[PDB]
């Protein structure tokens, strides 16, 4: 079910690899409708670690504009990928290369999209796909013009952040790559610089297929062998700890004391071993798999092992062949899956932390169905309904602003909707404080209906929030309202609706109350800038203009403060009324 | 839903700080002498061991604010403080913590307990070190004392504390009950190390190694073939099938921590060591799941507060204009009972979640949390005067402990601790008046001052006596008009009726009657 | 004003004069139901079903202006929020009627203003007591002792008005050959101090006792047995001094206060006084923040119907004894915020017929509780629906009634 699962067929796999070696010699490959694009790989010290950057692991933030939609939605921070790589990709961008041209051709004509490649021609085709994700299916997601990437042995080129948002826009499944079990390609990168320098030169120039290959220092190969791996386990024993481990303490000091690489695994990896092919989707479990795999048997095994990865590096061409010809098997949806890892080599310990990273995903999960659950409870509808018809009604027929009543009042009204609002920011703290800590799926944010119905409680609670803020003076204690004590959950929502809004606020009495005193020059600039996005509110609907044109209204009181002259300029004059 | 003991001991067997502490106590050793040296961005401080010692066992000379002297003073042994006057080792770590800002503190049996020493005196400041301190010490005597230990354990400081001992080593075993263990320790073995940071659990590893027969003098060399494979394990992985695999997790894991440690899983002394491993992690509800709750909980009694800031704000506009704190002093109107009905339930809910926050049911970062500092703030603004009113009202005449000194709840204590981890406020001049006072005990100090001029109006006629008992009432009135200013009290402190105006008439009253004005 | 009348001569006397009667309280403030059946009663001899017929019968009039009644949970429900209000109309009518000027009577007497002058039967000892079987005197500070002779020959009900501090007991009470009611109500902020009480004790005849915020006299021997006594109500009134009386048992010296209620009242330190009477039958003590422990040494109330409470924190949970009175049929238990686990053990409690709870933090019950099969009336509040669930499981008389809380600004005014 290989080709069900990834709906990538057999024969597909021999055009990509026959594609990646001609390559070798972005060489494009016509197969029919499918077009293979193949990049060429190279072996060399500056590629997979670039001199510019100093840390250990060589890493740059993706810039937002050249890669918009990565950044995590919350706390608004962006991923991190090799800087060679990243340099390649826009080298092949430019326009004398023509790629982009052959690609916008070939989607032109609804062909299909293959990107393909071996190790470094293979890590550069997978952010290649990534570039041509976001430059058309997320504009317009369509059948035809879904891509496919398929890659041997690349090594790790995306951080954590990087494979949550590939999750997110439920973009891993276009993502398959093939990874030998012994093979220090994919490997390598999970180490520090500074460790593998002193050998990375002699490791290349006989990993490189175009090379000889030959007179091969054991010595030297055995002491990367051995740095990588001593790197690899370490992050992999620091991430199996950090997702679920106790003495947090304990290991934040450590952290606080180490230095460890921040690339994580993504996309759906297969893994291949004589006995039968597996393939996982879970990227923490990912690694443990890197690790355990690779991890040595026997005496006679070992000094083999290096060999035996040096040789698989381009053993790939038995495995494309027999790719048929072995039993297929998901790790995922495999109920029972010691005796597959028994076969892949997997250790009890591996065995037990990949099964562990399931049940936590599991958990993750259940977590989501019982918040849709609690959601999903009239009462919530309710509380938000005593809001939205009975308080501001009768508000609008006391002629008070609901904001202006919440300010100064004594009607039990007001303490119904006090307690109301405390309720339901209660629960949107609890679903906000479980989406912070990575306990919530990556889709979470992803659906529309969570992100709608926190817009509209923003929308309709905020004001309270901000009236109960400004009405006990705690802006002349701590500050102003954007300065300090916005409640968080009103700006995730507010994020998570910009990038909705993004392909195709409410706390205007914010501002209100800070241009209160002090009028200045400054101040009426500032005023017209308010009148702008008042009408740009009410035309969206964030603010409701006739609760606010009220005569009543401390929005109204200000203006009756403003100077004639300013009033006579702005063009809210026949509204207000 | 893991025995994670052996995760961490892996986590820190592959950290190259592992094998780095090794290399500088074994320099340190070969040299003799105090060594000071960067490894990988990394200075280590090699105290060298001292073969003679007797560790037989407020402070003048030592300056450990975290001894907590309150508590049984911790019995510290004699021979290591003098040894840390002796070597006059703080003169050489003055001159070389200068800018640096990663150190990890490193020794060996004596010279372990010198950097232990070294690095609890450096951490046990009035303030912490700039740079981060962390101990690696392996063989080091288990010195220390119950008392000692549990310091560290409030400090939050038991973490940077890292010792490795083997199952062979009788140095740190050959101890006194009154030297109790603290920090990290990992009872390393050939096979693999497991890591235990409960006392209690290193205090019944030390008793059933005691009860086992292990007999290895030359302790040196088992340590250094024990690092080398230690560090050099990672490579060779091994089948750890421990012989009949558990199907439950926590019985397999502690059976492979049980292997690892070199105990047989169907041995005497391996079910006692299944045993006390199975009863090492604590099982209880995940903490963040319970943060959730919490906030839930904080959201259901905030309406109580809502309530008593109605109660407040109808009390402030009363015609009697007897001030909120008064009118609750004076107790008539089944508003008052109510109120109490509230605040009782806020007490309540506050105590329970400071309680739980110190039983560590919740991730440690709780008081960091940034909106629950925010909440304790405005509870501890909105509730404490109330409770100080309430337990006046209670106070007999011959109680005349106060709220200042005792009778304080320590929730209040926990929540000015968090109000102490905010931002520095704004010196913003305040426009009107503030909705709550800043002072969260000013309504007792005002009370004290009451006392104090009461019993200058009825005692102490002695001219000089009453010109002391002025001399110390005018700088609480100074303090009180300086507040005004700032308008750092609401409303009620200005009430005509209030206590305070009564209290300041009185004073203008005495100051006029002795001639004590200028 | 003449349909008023007209509504007077429908009511038969009856219930004619307990209205008449009625609206001889003070206008302004809020009669309590209780009292008013408990006067009623000790007037016209109507028994308690007629009575409250009677009040059914004046509430279809629009003149009866009952506050509400939350007390519908159920017929052991005491009285509840059921103050009425009446109409100044209606009392002008009563003395437009001038009962007692017309016959020159000492019953039907009332005085608006509570005004310190008394009457022109004061002045001059103009006081004729024809009969007095019914007296309202309203004063404010003036001497309760009057300025004239009131042998009261024939007066089975007596009320007083009063306000300020340091009060006296007038002679009257001694001079009255019979009385049944006494009624003393303080309208001051501060409570109020009494002088002379010996001139009430000097009766043995009265049968109901009702006060408040008054600084209740000490309970000792002085006081002669009152054997009629069956109601006591206590009112804001620090009883520091007259409680912890256990030297004289109040039963031995007479079987009064067959039923005792305690409202809005603190310093109640101990109550072995309270359990030591062998005669009481109903106990209600509420809004009390002060008290922690109800004494074990209860078994001398074996009698009691129903105990309720309403509010009090510092009560750590329910004694064991609970289920000991087999003529315990009505439990209230709410507002009380410690109350974790409520130890009811309601297996030997079978004489419970209705349990109401508006709101608790009951957090458990023993499986006695489900044992007991008179579980109906079972008033709970939003939570702990899934207990008696399992109680209906078992008994499926539970009769629940679940409570939702609501939130008024009523509170904050007076
Ligand atoms: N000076 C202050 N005093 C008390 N709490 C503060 C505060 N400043 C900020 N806060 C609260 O602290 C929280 C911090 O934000 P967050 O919950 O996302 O971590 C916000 O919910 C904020 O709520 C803001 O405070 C207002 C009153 O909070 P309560 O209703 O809980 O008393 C809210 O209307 C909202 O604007």
Same mark, same amino acid.
């Given at each position: 079910?290989?080709?069900?699962?990834?709906?990538?067929?057999?024969?597909?796999?021999?055009?990509?690899?026959?594609?990646?070696?001609?390559?070798?010699? #972005?060489?494009?490959?016509?197969?029919?409708?499918?077009?293979?694009?193949?990049?060429?790989?190279?072996?060399?010290?500056?590629?997979?670690?670039?001199?510019?950057?100093?840390?250990?692991?060589?890493?740059?933030?993706?810039?937002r504009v050249?890669?918009?939609?990565?950044?995590?939605?919350?706390?608004g921070?962006?991923?991190?990928?090799?800087?060679?790589?990243?340099?390649?990709?826009?080298?092949?961008?430019?326009?004398?290369?023509?790629?982009?041209?052959?690609?916008?051709?070939?989607?032109?004509?609804?062909?299909?999209?293959?990107?393909?490649?071996?190790?470094?021609?293979?890590?550069?085709?997978?952010?290649?796909?990534?570039?041509?994700?976001?430059?058309?299916?997320?504009?317009?997601?369509?059948?035809?013009?879904?891509?496919?990437?398929?890659?041997?042995?690349?090594?790790?080129?995306?951080?954590?952040?990087?494979?949550?948002?590939?999750?997110?826009?439920?973009?891993?499944?276009?993502?398959?790559?093939?990874?030998?079990?012994?093979?220090?390609?994919?490997?390598?990168?999970?180490?520090?610089?500074?460790?593998?320098?002193?050998?990375?030169?002699?490791?290349?120039?006989?990993?490189?297929?175009?090379?000889?290959?030959?007179?091969?220092?054991?010595?030297?190969?055995?002491?990367?062998?051995?740095?990588?791996?001593?790197?690899?386990?370490?992050?992999?024993?620091?991430?199996?700890?950090?997702?679920?481990?106790?003495?947090?303490?304990?290991?934040?000091?450590?952290?606080?004391?180490?230095?460890?690489?921040? #690339?994580?695994?993504?996309?759906?990896?297969?893994?291949?071993?004589?006995?039968?092919?597996?393939?996982?989707?879970?990227?923490?479990?990912?690694?443990?798999?890197?690790?355990?795999?690779?991890?040595?048997?026997?005496?006679?095994?070992?000094?083999?092992?290096?060999?035996?990865?040096?040789?698989?590096?381009?053993?790939?061409?038995?495995?494309?062949?027999?790719?048929?010809?072995?039993?297929?098997?998901?790790?995922?949806?495999?109920?029972?899956?010691?005796?597959?890892?028994?076969?892949?080599?997997?250790?009890?310990?591996?065995?037990?932390?990949?099964?562990?990273?399931?049940?936590?995903?599991?958990?993750?999960?259940?977590?989501?169905?019982?918040?849709?659950?609690?959601?999903?409870?009239?009462?919530?509808?309710?509380?938000?309904?005593?809001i939205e018809?009975?308080y501001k009604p009768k508000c609008q027929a006391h002629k008070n602003g609901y904001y202006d009543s919440f300010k100064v009042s004594?009607?039990?009204?007001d303490?119904?909707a006090?307690?109301?609002r405390?309720?339901?920011?209660?629960?949107?703290?609890?679903?906000?404080?479980?989406?912070?800590?990575?306990?919530?799926?990556?889709?979470?944010?992803?659906?529309?209906?969570?992100?709608?119905?926190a817009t509209r409680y923003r929308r309709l609670v905020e004001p309270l929030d901000i009236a109960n803020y400004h009405r006990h003076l705690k802006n002349e204690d701590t500050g102003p309202y954007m300065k300090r004590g916005r409640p968080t959950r009103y700006i995730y929502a507010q994020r998570g609706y910009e990038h909705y809004i993004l392909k195709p606020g409410s706390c205007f009495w914010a501002e209100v109350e800070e241009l209160k005193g002090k009028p200045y020059e400054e101040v009426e600039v500032r005023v017209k800038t308010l009148e702008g996005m008042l009408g740009e509110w009410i035309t969206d609907g964030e603010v409701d203009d006739k609760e606010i044109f009220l005569e009543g209204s401390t929005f109204r009181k200000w203006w009756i403060t403003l100077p004639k002259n300013h009033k006579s300029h702005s063009p809210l004059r026949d509204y207000m009324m | *839903?893991?025995?994670?003991?052996?995760?961490?001991?892996?986590?820190?067997?592959?950290?190259?700080?592992?094998?780095?502490?090794?290399?500088?106590?074994?320099?340190?050793?070969?040299?003799?002498?105090?060594?000071?040296?960067?490894?990988?961005?990394?200075?280590?401080?090699?105290?060298?061991?001292?073969?003679?010692?007797?560790?037989?066992?407020?402070?003048?000379?030592?300056?450990?604010?975290?001894?907590?002297?309150?508590?049984?003073?911790?019995?510290?042994?004699?021979?290591?403080?003098?040894?840390?006057?002796?070597?006059?080792?703080?003169?050489?770590?003055?001159?070389?913590?200068?800018?640096?800002?990663?150190?990890?503190?490193?020794?060996?049996?004596?010279?372990?307990?010198?950097?232990?020493?070294?690095?609890?005196?450096?951490?046990?400041?009035?303030?912490?070190?700039?740079?981060?301190?962390?101990?690696?010490?392996?063989?080091?005597?288990?010195?220390?004392?119950?008392?000692?230990?549990?310091?560290?354990?409030?400090?939050?400081?038991?973490?940077?504390?890292?010792?490795?001992?083997?199952?062979?080593?009788?140095?740190?075993?050959?101890?006194?009950?009154?030297?109790?263990?603290?920090?990290?320790?990992?009872?390393?073995?050939?096979?693999?190390?497991?890591?235990?940071?409960?006392?209690?659990?290193?205090?019944?590893?030390?008793?059933?190694?005691?009860?086992?027969?292990?007999?290895?003098?030359?302790?040196?060399?088992?340590?250094?073939?024990?690092?080398?494979?230690?560090?050099?394990?990672?490579?060779?992985? *091994?089948?750890?099938?421990?012989?009949?695999?558990?199907?439950?997790?926590?019985?397999?894991?502690?059976?492979?921590?049980?292997?690892?440690?070199?105990?047989?899983?169907?041995?005497?002394?391996?079910?006692?060591?299944?045993?006390?491993?199975?009863?090492?992690?604590?099982?209880?509800?995940?903490?963040?799941?319970?943060?959730?709750?919490?906030?839930?909980?904080?959201?259901?009694?905030?309406?109580?507060?809502?309530?008593?800031?109605?109660?407040?704000?109808?009390?402030?506009?009363?015609?009697?204009?007897?001030?909120?704190?008064?009118?609750?002093? *004076?107790?008539?109107?089944?508003?008052?009972?109510?109120?109490?009905?509230?605040?009782?339930?806020?007490?309540?809910?506050?105590?329970?979640?400071?309680?739980?926050?110190?039983?560590?049911?919740?991730?440690?970062?709780?008081?960091?949390?940034?909106?629950?500092?925010?909440?304790?703030?405005?509870?501890?603004?909105?509730?404490?005067?109330?409770?100080?009113?309430?337990?006046?009202?209670?106070?007999?005449?011959?109680?005349?402990?106060?709220?200042?000194?005792?009778?304080?709840?320590?929730?209040?204590?926990?929540?000015?601790?968090?109000?102490?981890?905010?931002?520095?406020?704004e010196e913003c001049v305040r426009s009107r008046?503030?909705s709550?006072?800043?002072?969260?005990?000013?309504?007792?100090?005002?009370?004290?001052?009451?006392?104090?001029?009461?019993?200058?109006?009825?005692?102490?006629?002695?001219?000089?006596?009453?010109?002391?008992?002025?001399?110390?009432?005018?700088?609480?009135?100074?303090?009180?008009?300086?507040?005004?200013?700032?308008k750092?009290?609401?409303?009620?402190?200005?009430?005509?009726?209030?206590?305070?105006?009564?209290?300041?008439?009185?004073?203008?009253?005495?100051?006029?009657?002795?001639?004590?004005?200028? | 004003?003449?349909?008023?009348?007209?509504?007077?001569?429908?009511?038969?006397?009856?219930?004619?004069?307990?209205?008449?009667?009625?609206?001889?309280?003070?206008?302004?403030?809020?009669?309590?139901?209780?009292?008013?059946?408990?006067?009623?009663?000790?007037?016209?001899?109507?028994?308690?079903?007629?009575?409250?017929?009677?009040?059914?019968?004046?509430?279809?009039?629009?003149?009866?202006?009952?506050?509400?009644?939350?007390?519908?949970?159920?017929?052991?429900?005491?009285?509840?929020?059921?103050?009425?209000?009446?109409?100044?109309?209606?009392?002008?009518?009563?003395?437009?009627?001038?009962?007692?000027?017309?016959?020159?009577?000492?019953?039907?007497?009332?005085?608006?203003?509570?005004?310190?002058?008394?009457?022109?039967?004061?002045?001059?000892?103009?006081?004729?007591?024809?009969?007095?079987?019914?007296?309202?005197?309203?004063?404010?500070?003036?001497?309760?002792?009057?300025?004239?002779?009131?042998?009261?020959?024939?007066?089975?009900?007596?009320?007083?008005?009063?306000?300020?501090?340091?009060?006296?007991?007038?002679?009257?009470?001694?001079?009255?050959?019979?009385?049944?009611?006494?009624?003393?109500?303080?309208?001051?902020?501060?409570?109020?101090?009494?002088?002379?009480?010996?001139?009430?004790?000097?009766?043995?005849?009265?049968?109901?006792?009702?006060?408040?915020?008054?600084?209740?006299?000490?309970?000792?021997?002085?006081?002669?047995?009152?054997?009629?006594?069956?109601?006591?109500?206590?009112?804001?009134?620090?009883?520091?001094?007259?409680?912890?009386?256990?030297?004289?048992?109040?039963?031995?010296?007479?079987?009064?206060?067959?039923?005792?209620?305690?409202?809005?009242?603190?310093?109640?330190?101990?109550?072995?006084?309270?359990?030591?009477?062998?005669?009481?039958?109903?106990?209600?003590?509420?809004?009390?923040?002060?008290?922690?422990?109800?004494?074990?040494?209860?078994?001398?109330?074996?009698?009691?119907?129903?105990?309720?409470?309403?509010?009090?924190?510092?009560?750590?949970?329910?004694?064991?004894?609970?289920?000991?009175?087999?003529?315990?049929?009505?439990?209230?238990?709410?507002?009380?915020?410690?109350?974790?686990?409520?130890?009811?053990?309601?297996?030997?409690?079978?004489?419970?017929?209705?349990?109401?709870?508006?709101?608790?933090?009951?957090?458990?019950?023993?499986?006695?509780?489900?044992?007991?099969?008179?579980?109906?009336?079972?008033?709970?509040?939003?939570?702990?629906?899934?207990?008696?669930?399992?109680?209906?499981?078992?008994?499926?008389?539970?009769?629940?009634?679940?409570?939702?809380?609501?939130?008024?600004?009523?509170?904050?005014?007076?």
């Amino acid at each position: 079910a290989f080709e069900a699962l990834t709906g990538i067929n057999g024969d597909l796999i021999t055009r990509s690899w026959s594609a990646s070696k001609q390559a070798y010699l #972005y060489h494009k490959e016509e197969a029919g409708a499918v077009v293979i694009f193949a990049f060429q790989p190279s072996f060399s010290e500056k590629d997979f670690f670039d001199p510019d950057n100093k840390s250990s692991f060589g890493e740059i933030k993706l810039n937002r504009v050249q890669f918009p939609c990565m950044r995590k939605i919350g706390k608004g921070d962006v991923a991190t990928v090799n800087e060679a790589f990243l340099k390649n990709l826009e080298a092949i961008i430019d326009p004398r290369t023509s790629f982009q041209a052959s690609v916008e051709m070939a989607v032109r004509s609804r062909k299909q999209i293959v990107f393909t490649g071996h190790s470094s021609g293979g890590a550069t085709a997978i952010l290649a796909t990534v570039w041509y994700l976001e430059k058309y299916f997320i504009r317009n997601p369509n059948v035809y013009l879904e891509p496919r990437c398929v890659t041997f042995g690349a090594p790790l080129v995306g951080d954590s952040i990087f494979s949550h948002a590939l999750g997110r826009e439920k973009w891993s499944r276009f993502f398959v790559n093939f990874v030998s079990r012994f093979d220090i390609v994919p490997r390598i990168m999970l180490a520090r610089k500074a460790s593998v320098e002193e050998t990375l030169p002699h490791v290349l120039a006989q990993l490189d297929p175009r090379k000889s290959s030959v007179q091969e220092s054991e010595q030297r190969i055995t002491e990367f062998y051995t740095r990588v791996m001593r790197d690899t386990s370490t992050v992999a024993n620091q991430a199996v700890c950090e997702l679920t481990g106790s003495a947090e303490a304990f290991l934040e000091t450590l952290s606080s004391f180490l230095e460890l690489s921040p #690339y994580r695994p993504a996309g759906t990896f297969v893994f291949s071993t004589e006995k039968r092919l597996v393939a996982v989707n879970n990227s923490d479990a990912i690694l443990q798999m890197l690790f355990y795999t690779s991890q040595a048997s026997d005496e006679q095994e070992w000094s083999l092992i290096p060999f035996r990865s040096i040789r698989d590096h381009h053993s790939y061409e038995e495995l494309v062949q027999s790719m048929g010809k072995k039993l297929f098997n998901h790790l995922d949806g495999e109920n029972s899956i010691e005796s597959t890892l028994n076969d892949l080599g997997v250790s009890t310990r591996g065995r037990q932390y990949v099964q562990a990273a399931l049940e936590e995903e599991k958990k993750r999960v259940e977590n989501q169905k019982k918040i849709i659950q609690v959601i999903e409870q009239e009462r919530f509808l309710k509380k938000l309904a005593w809001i939205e018809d009975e308080y501001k009604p009768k508000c609008q027929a006391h002629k008070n602003g609901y904001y202006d009543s919440f300010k100064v009042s004594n009607e039990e009204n007001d303490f119904k909707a006090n307690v109301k609002r405390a309720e339901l920011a209660g629960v949107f703290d609890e679903v906000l404080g479980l989406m912070k800590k990575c306990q919530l799926p990556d889709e979470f944010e992803g659906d529309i209906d969570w992100i709608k119905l926190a817009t509209r409680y923003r929308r309709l609670v905020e004001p309270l929030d901000i009236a109960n803020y400004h009405r006990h003076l705690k802006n002349e204690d701590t500050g102003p309202y954007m300065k300090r004590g916005r409640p968080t959950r009103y700006i995730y929502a507010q994020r998570g609706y910009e990038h909705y809004i993004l392909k195709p606020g409410s706390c205007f009495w914010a501002e209100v109350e800070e241009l209160k005193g002090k009028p200045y020059e400054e101040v009426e600039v500032r005023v017209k800038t308010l009148e702008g996005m008042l009408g740009e509110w009410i035309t969206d609907g964030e603010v409701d203009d006739k609760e606010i044109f009220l005569e009543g209204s401390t929005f109204r009181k200000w203006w009756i403060t403003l100077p004639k002259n300013h009033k006579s300029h702005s063009p809210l004059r026949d509204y207000m009324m | *839903r893991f025995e994670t003991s052996e995760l961490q001991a892996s986590v820190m067997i592959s950290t190259p700080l592992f094998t780095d502490s090794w290399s500088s106590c074994n320099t340190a050793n070969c040299n003799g002498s105090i060594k000071i040296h960067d490894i990988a961005g990394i200075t280590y401080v090699a105290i060298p061991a001292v073969s003679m010692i007797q560790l037989g066992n407020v402070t003048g000379d030592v300056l450990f604010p975290g001894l907590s002297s309150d508590e049984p003073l911790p019995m510290v042994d004699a021979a290591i403080l003098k040894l840390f006057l002796q070597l006059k080792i703080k003169e050489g770590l003055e001159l070389e913590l200068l800018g640096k800002k990663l150190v990890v503190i490193t020794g060996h049996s004596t010279g372990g307990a010198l950097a232990a020493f070294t690095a609890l005196w450096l951490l046990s400041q009035s303030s912490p070190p700039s740079f981060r301190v962390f101990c690696i010490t392996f063989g080091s005597p288990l010195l220390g004392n119950q008392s000692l230990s549990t310091s560290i354990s409030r400090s939050r400081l038991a973490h940077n504390f890292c010792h490795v001992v083997s199952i062979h080593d009788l140095v740190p075993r050959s101890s006194n009950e009154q030297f109790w263990p603290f920090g990290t320790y990992l009872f390393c073995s050939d096979k693999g190390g497991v890591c235990l940071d409960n006392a209690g659990s290193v205090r019944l590893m030390f008793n059933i190694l005691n009860t086992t027969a292990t007999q290895n003098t030359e302790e040196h060399q088992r340590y250094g073939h024990y690092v080398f494979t230690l560090s050099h394990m990672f490579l060779k992985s *091994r089948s750890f099938l421990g012989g009949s695999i558990p199907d439950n997790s926590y019985q397999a894991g502690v059976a492979l921590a049980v292997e690892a440690l070199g105990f047989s899983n169907d041995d005497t002394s391996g079910v006692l060591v299944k045993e006390c491993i199975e009863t090492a992690t604590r099982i209880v509800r995940a903490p963040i799941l319970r943060s959730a709750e919490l906030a839930n909980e904080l959201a259901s009694v905030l309406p109580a507060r809502l309530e008593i800031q109605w109660y407040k704000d109808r009390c402030d506009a009363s015609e009697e204009q007897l001030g909120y704190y008064d009118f609750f002093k *004076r107790y008539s109107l089944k508003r008052d009972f109510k109120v109490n009905m509230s605040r009782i339930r806020l007490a309540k809910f506050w105590d329970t979640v400071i309680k739980m926050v110190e039983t560590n049911e919740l991730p440690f970062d709780f008081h960091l949390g940034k909106k629950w500092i925010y909440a304790s703030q405005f509870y501890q603004l909105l509730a404490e005067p109330l409770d100080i009113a309430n337990f006046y009202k209670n106070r007999d005449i011959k109680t005349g402990g106060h709220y200042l000194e005792g009778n304080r709840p320590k929730r209040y204590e926990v929540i000015d601790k968090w109000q102490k981890g905010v931002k520095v406020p704004e010196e913003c001049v305040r426009s009107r008046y503030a909705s709550t006072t800043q002072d969260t005990c000013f309504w007792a100090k005002l009370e004290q001052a009451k006392e104090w001029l009461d019993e200058a109006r009825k005692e102490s006629s002695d001219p000089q006596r009453r010109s002391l008992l002025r001399e110390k009432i005018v700088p609480f009135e100074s303090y009180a008009n300086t507040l005004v200013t700032k308008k750092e009290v609401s409303l009620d402190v200005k009430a005509k009726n209030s206590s305070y105006s009564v209290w300041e008439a009185n004073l203008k009253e005495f100051k006029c009657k002795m001639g004590y004005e200028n | 004003f003449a349909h008023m009348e007209e509504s007077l001569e429908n009511l038969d006397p009856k219930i004619r004069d307990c209205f008449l009667d009625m609206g001889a309280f003070p206008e302004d403030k809020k009669i309590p139901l209780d009292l008013l059946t408990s006067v009623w009663v000790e007037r016209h001899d109507i028994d308690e079903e007629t009575a409250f017929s009677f009040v059914l019968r004046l509430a279809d009039k629009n003149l009866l202006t009952i506050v509400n009644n939350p007390r519908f949970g159920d017929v052991h429900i005491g009285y509840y929020d059921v103050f009425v209000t009446q109409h100044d109309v209606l009392r002008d009518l009563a003395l437009h009627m001038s009962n007692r000027v017309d016959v020159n009577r000492r019953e039907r007497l009332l005085m608006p203003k509570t005004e310190p002058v008394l009457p022109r039967e004061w002045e001059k000892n103009k006081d004729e007591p024809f009969d007095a079987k019914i007296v309202s005197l309203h004063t404010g500070e003036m001497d309760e002792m009057n300025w004239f002779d009131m042998d009261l020959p024939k007066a089975e009900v007596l009320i007083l008005n009063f306000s300020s501090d340091n009060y006296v007991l007038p002679p009257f009470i001694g001079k009255m050959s019979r009385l049944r009611v006494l009624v003393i109500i303080n309208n001051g902020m501060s409570p109020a101090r009494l002088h002379g009480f010996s001139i009430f004790a000097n009766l043995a005849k009265l049968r109901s006792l009702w006060l408040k915020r008054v600084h209740v006299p000490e309970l000792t021997s002085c006081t002669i047995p009152l054997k009629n006594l069956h109601k006591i109500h206590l009112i804001f009134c620090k009883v520091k001094n007259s409680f912890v009386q256990t030297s004289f048992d109040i039963s031995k010296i007479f079987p009064s206060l067959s039923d005792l209620t305690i409202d809005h009242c603190d310093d109640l330190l101990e109550l072995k006084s309270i359990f030591g009477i062998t005669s009481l039958n109903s106990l209600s003590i509420t809004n009390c923040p002060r008290i922690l422990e109800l004494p074990k040494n209860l078994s001398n109330v074996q009698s009691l119907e129903r105990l309720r409470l309403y509010a009090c924190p510092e009560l750590i949970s329910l004694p064991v004894e609970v289920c000991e009175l087999p003529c315990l049929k009505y439990v209230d238990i709410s507002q009380c915020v410690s109350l974790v686990s409520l130890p009811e053990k309601f297996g030997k409690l079978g004489s419970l017929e209705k349990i109401d709870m508006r709101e608790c933090s009951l957090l458990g019950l023993p499986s006695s509780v489900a044992a007991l099969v008179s579980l109906r009336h079972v008033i709970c509040d939003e939570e702990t629906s899934s207990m008696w669930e399992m109680v209906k499981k078992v008994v499926p008389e539970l009769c629940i009634e679940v409570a939702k809380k609501c939130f008024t600004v009523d509170w904050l005014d007076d």
